[PDB]
Design a protein around this ligand. Structure first.
Ligand SMILES: Nc1ccn([C@H]2CC[C@@H](COP(=O)(O)OP(=O)(O)OP(=O)(O)O)O2)c(=O)n1
Length: 549
DNA sequence: CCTGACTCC
DNA sequence: GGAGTCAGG
């Protein structure tokens, strides 16, 4: 039971200075995607608008871009970007229910209005998947069924804003939402829409040469193996290694023999085929993911790739990057690192600028553990612990004796008693409170932390150790991003952000601005928050992302 | 569609 | 510790 007006045209009462707004983009990847419908809920009533009509209306477009007309939405970035592709600016977004839900509890995995409403027992709205359907059945339903959904979603947002803000305020997270995540969302929207330009000629040439080399390595493997098999099948590979060649089985998973990189490396003294296999799988991933996969999503006319930064997914407060993922482009082996030569500025006589925090997580450990020996070390400017590594895990990682690994860790805690203290204290806090928190009050709940089951419990305790560290770094670089764009905009530099990579920011700019960026960027990033230790940032620029080192 | 690869922070 | 994509099955 909910009345609404199926409008044939926009009226003045639709354009109030506060509204719940739904700009519906049904395709998961919203870049250049259709807007299938619009809904507005305000003091005056509920309205559905056809996008052809509304978006072609100069008064509705004006309202959309008016910062003083406040909108409450769910996933405003999706809307803001889809509107950019329609040549329309979205302003005045004051509340995002997606981001509010994420801050309240990231484990709920809220990705539609219905799921957010569930957190307040609000039931007068359907899940999106139930309206549109799954997979090949996915479709926009008949207008009256569509219109009712969009309106119900707007009505839900309208009624849920204050209950959500009230709870955020109770948790002291309202500023985290309004001053950080919400402004970050607009910045991410800008980055996504700008995209990153790709040198397809170079990428395609790399692909051709990689293909030849895969063939050569492939044949060499079959020769060493004494047989042809699918190297990309862990199962067939297992038979070759552990049955035909009779190499030792160092690890098994629930499906059979492990052929992990760690395991194969340890088998190098037994047979020279394992090294070749490792090489083959490296090359094949470069080809399948960073040449072919990347070329598939390049927009041919502009040669740009447009990632989507998921702001409400990770359990720690980090972003993730999808379709394509630009936060896992190779760098560690020169062979893969060369992929970065294909990422270039979007304008002639521009350069790529790259700035990275040095050891941000170990410094956060220092700051939050208040370890003197660790803080003193950073003031002189002089990881496994941070992930809760065992003696076993460390022995294996370093391929050394466990006794020696265990002694390394025991020594470590003896040497850093304040870190050892933090670890014990943060776990105890998690057990007492049921959640851990970050510098800017991001939380993660850990309902398993008192499980009687050793493995379940242990994993939870490790999360208690790590999340405040990783999450606090996420908080910092996010703050650094918001401040940076402000510092860029005032002094009207043309430079703009392209990418964030966890503890790194990647920009493009006219070559003329490099000197000013060498000053501005590292400063802003270091002055993002003030810790007990100093924040350090390294920076480079160059003709391509590769050269920015 | 899941698992186990390789990739980053 | 936190992520995404890919091929095989
Ligand atoms: N209503 C609030 C209050 C705080 N915060 C987040 C944003 C910044 C961070 C700092 O909190 P402050 O009040 O400025 O410092 P504090 O009180 O000393 O924080 P803490 O309780 O952790 O010591 O917390 C928030 O999101 N919403």
């Amino acid at each position: 039971k909910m009345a609404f007006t199926l409008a044939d045209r926009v009226t003045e009462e639709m354009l109030a200075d506060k509204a719940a707004l739904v700009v519906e983009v049904v395709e998961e990847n919203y870049h250049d995607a259709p807007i299938v419908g619009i809904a507005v809920v305000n003091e005056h009533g509920r309205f559905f608008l056809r996008p052809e009509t509304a978006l072609a209306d100069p008064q509705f477009v004006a309202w959309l871009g008016d910062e003083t007309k406040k909108k409450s939405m769910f996933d405003s970035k999706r809307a803001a970007v889809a509107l950019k592709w329609k040549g329309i600016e979205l302003c005045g977004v004051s509340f995002d229910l997606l981001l509010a839900a994420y801050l309240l509890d990231p484990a709920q995995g809220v990705d539609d209005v219905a799921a957010a409403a569930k957190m307040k027992q609000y039931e007068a709205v359907r899940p999106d998947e139930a309206v549109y359907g799954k997979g090949a059945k996915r479709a926009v339903p008949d207008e009256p069924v569509l219109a009712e959904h969009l309106v119900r979603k707007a009505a839900a947002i309208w009624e849920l804003e204050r209950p959500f803000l009230d709870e955020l305020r109770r948790n002291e997270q309202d500023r985290l939402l309004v001053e950080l995540e919400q402004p970050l969302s607009s910045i991410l929207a800008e980055m996504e829409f700008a995209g990153v330009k790709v040198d397809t000629k170079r990428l395609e040439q790399m692909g051709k040469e990689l293909a030849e080399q895969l063939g050569t390595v492939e044949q060499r493997i079959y020769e060493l193996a004494g047989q042809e098999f699918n190297i990309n099948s862990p199962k067939q590979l297992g038979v070759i290694l552990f049955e035909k060649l009779q190499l030792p089985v160092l690890k098994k998973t629930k499906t059979g023999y492990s052929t992990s990189a760690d395991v194969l490396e340890k088998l190098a003294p037994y047979h020279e085929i394992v090294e070749n296999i490792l090489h083959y799988r490296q090359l094949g991933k470069l080809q399948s993911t960073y040449i072919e996969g990347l070329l598939k999503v390049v927009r041919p006319a502009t040669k740009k790739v447009h990632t989507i930064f998921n702001q409400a997914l990770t359990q720690t407060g980090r972003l993730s990057s999808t379709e394509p993922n630009l936060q896992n482009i190779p760098i560690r082996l020169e062979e893969g690192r060369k992929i970065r030569q294909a990422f270039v500025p979007s304008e002639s006589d521009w350069l790529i600028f790259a700035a990275d925090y040095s050891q941000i997580e170990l410094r956060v450990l220092a700051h939050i553990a208040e370890d003197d020996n660790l803080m003193e070390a950073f003031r002189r400017d002089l990881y496994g612990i941070v992930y809760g590594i065992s003696d076993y895990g460390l022995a294996q990682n370093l391929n050394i004796s466990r006794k020696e690994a265990a002694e390394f860790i025991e020594r470590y805690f003896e040497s850093f008693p304040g870190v050892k203290r933090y670890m014990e204290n943060i776990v105890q806090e998690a057990k007492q409170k049921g959640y851990v928190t970050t510098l800017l009050h991001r939380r993660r709940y850990l309902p398993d932390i008192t499980s009687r089951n050793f493995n379940v419990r242990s994993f939870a305790e490790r999360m208690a150790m790590n999340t405040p560290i990783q999450g606090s770094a996420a908080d910092i670089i996010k703050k650094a991003m918001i401040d940076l764009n402000a510092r860029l905009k005032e002094e009207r530099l043309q430079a703009h952000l392209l990418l964030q990579v966890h503890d790194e920011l990647i920009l493009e700019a006219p070559k003329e601005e490099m000197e000013r960026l060498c000053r501005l960027v590292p400063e802003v990033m270091e002055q993002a928050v003030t810790l007990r230790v100093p924040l350090k940032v390294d920076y480079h620029y160059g003709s391509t992302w590769y050269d920015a080192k």
